[PDB]
Design a protein around this ligand. Sequence first.
Ligand SMILES: CC[C@H]1OC(=O)[C@H](C)[C@@H](O[C@H]2C[C@@](C)(OC)[C@@H](O)[C@H](C)O2)[C@H](C)[C@@H](O[C@@H]2O[C@H](C)C[C@H](N(C)C)[C@H]2O)[C@](C)(O)C[C@@H](C)C(=O)[C@H](C)[C@@H](O)[C@]1(C)O
Ligand SMILES: O=c1ccn([C@@H]2O[C@H](COP(=O)(O)OP(=O)(O)O)[C@@H](O)[C@H]2O)c(=O)[nH]1
Length: 384
Amino acid sequence: AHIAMFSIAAHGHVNPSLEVIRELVARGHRVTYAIPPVFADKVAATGPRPVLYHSTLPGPDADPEAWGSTLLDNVEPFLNDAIQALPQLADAYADDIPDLVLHDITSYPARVLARRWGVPAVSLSPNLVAWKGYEEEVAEPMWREPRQTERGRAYYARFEAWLKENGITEHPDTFASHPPRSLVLIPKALQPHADRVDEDVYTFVGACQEGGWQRPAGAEKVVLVSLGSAFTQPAFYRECVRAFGNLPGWHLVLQIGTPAELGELPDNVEVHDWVPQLAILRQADLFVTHAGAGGSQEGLATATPMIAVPQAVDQFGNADMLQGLGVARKLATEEATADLLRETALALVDDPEVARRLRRIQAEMAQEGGTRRAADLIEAELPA
Ligand SMILES: CC[C@H]1OC(=O)[C@H](C)[C@@H](O[C@H]2C[C@@](C)(OC)[C@@H](O)[C@H](C)O2)[C@H](C)[C@@H](O[C@@H]2O[C@H](C)C[C@H](N(C)C)[C@H]2O)[C@](C)(O)C[C@@H](C)C(=O)[C@H](C)[C@@H](O)[C@]1(C)O
Ligand SMILES: O=c1ccn([C@@H]2O[C@H](COP(=O)(O)OP(=O)(O)O)[C@@H](O)[C@H]2O)c(=O)[nH]1
C-alpha cells in the first residue's frame, strides 16, 4: 500500500513515530513522508521518501517561546501554517494519491487531504488525548473568555470558513481535537481520565522506541538523577549529592548536562554530562526525574520507582499522575533538600506495594505493544 505520513519540523512531533515509519517500510509498504526540508534527512533514514513542503512554524531548534505563551498565540500558528501548506501538499500528491494517510496531531492539511481523497486517516498523538467529557470539562472553560474577544471570534470564524471552503462542516474543535481514529504514543498510565477515553477511537501503544552500563559490584541501591535534556539546577544537584553521598549501600549516577560547581564528590557518586539513560534505568532502583514525557515513560517501562521534581509546565501533570499511580513521590524543587530526598528514596525502594504496582504497569505497557503493535494497527486500517 502507499501510506503517506504528514508532520511538521519539530522533534516532539517526528521522533515519537519514526520507528513506526521504519517498521511499515520494513514490511514492504511504500511510505512517503510530508515534511519540511530541514527534517528531510531525519525522515529519509526510515526508508520513507520525503515529500517537501514549506512551513511557517518555528524551526526545530527555536526556543520554546517561539511557539507563543497565550492560548491564541499557541493555536493560531497551526491554522496559518495549514492554510499555506495545504495547496503545496495537494499539488505534491495530485498524481499519486495515497491509500492511507498517517499524521501527527499538528497537521491540519493531512486531515483535509484524507477527507478530500476519501481515504482513511490515522492520527498519531505523542501526548495525552481527549477523553469523553473533555469538551465540557477542559475545552469550553479554556475557550470561554478568549472566544468572546474580537481576536478569538475572528480566529474561530476564519477556521470555520477555511474548513467550509474545503467541504468540511465539522466545527473547528471537532476537526482539530477529535480524530475519528488515533494511536497514542504514550502509556495509558500517563493519560488523565484514562477510563473515560473512547477505546473505539483511541488505542494506546506507548512509546515506539547507547552503550551499556554496569552497576558497581556490591551496590545495593542505584539511583539515577536526570532532569532530561533541556531543564538541567546546581543547588538541587548539590542536595542530591548530600542526600546519597556516603549513604551505605547506595550509588548515585548524577546526569548534570560544571562538575567543579558541585564541589568535591563522595566516592559513591559518578557524574556525567550525558548518560545512556535507558541502560542505567534497567539497572537502577530509583530514578530522580523532572517527569518529562520520556523520563516518565522510561521509569515506568523499567519498573523504577521515581522521585518526581517537575521543572516546567509540561511536567507537573506527569508528576501528579506518577504519584497517583502509587509509584512515585512528587517534590517541589525548593523542598527537595538532602534530608527529604533521602527519606523519600528509602521509603520508595523498600516498598513492596510500589514494586507490585510497577510490575503491573509494566505488564499493562506490554499489552500496549509499541512499534510493532502500532504498525499492526495501522495495517488494520488499510482499505480492503
Ligand atoms: C487534547 C488534544 C489536544 O492536545 C493538547 O491539548 C496537547 C496536550 C497540546 O499540548 C499542551 C500541553 C503543553 C505542555 O505542550 C505539550 C503546552 O505547552 C501546550 C500549549 O498545550 C498540544 C501538543 C499543543 O502543541 C504544542 O503547542 C506548543 C505551543 C508548542 C509544542 N511544540 C511544537 C514545541 C506543541 O507540541 C497544541 C497547541 O495544542 C497543538 C495544536 C495543534 C492544537 O490546538 C491541537 C489541535 C490540540 O488542541 C489537541 C491535539 O486537540
Ligand atoms: O543524559 C541523558 C539525558 C536524557 N536522555 C534521554 O533523553 C530523553 C529526554 O526526554 P524527556 O521527555 O524525559 O525530557 P526533556 O528533555 O524533553 O525535558 C529521554 O528519552 C532520556 O532517556 C538520555 O538518554 N541521556
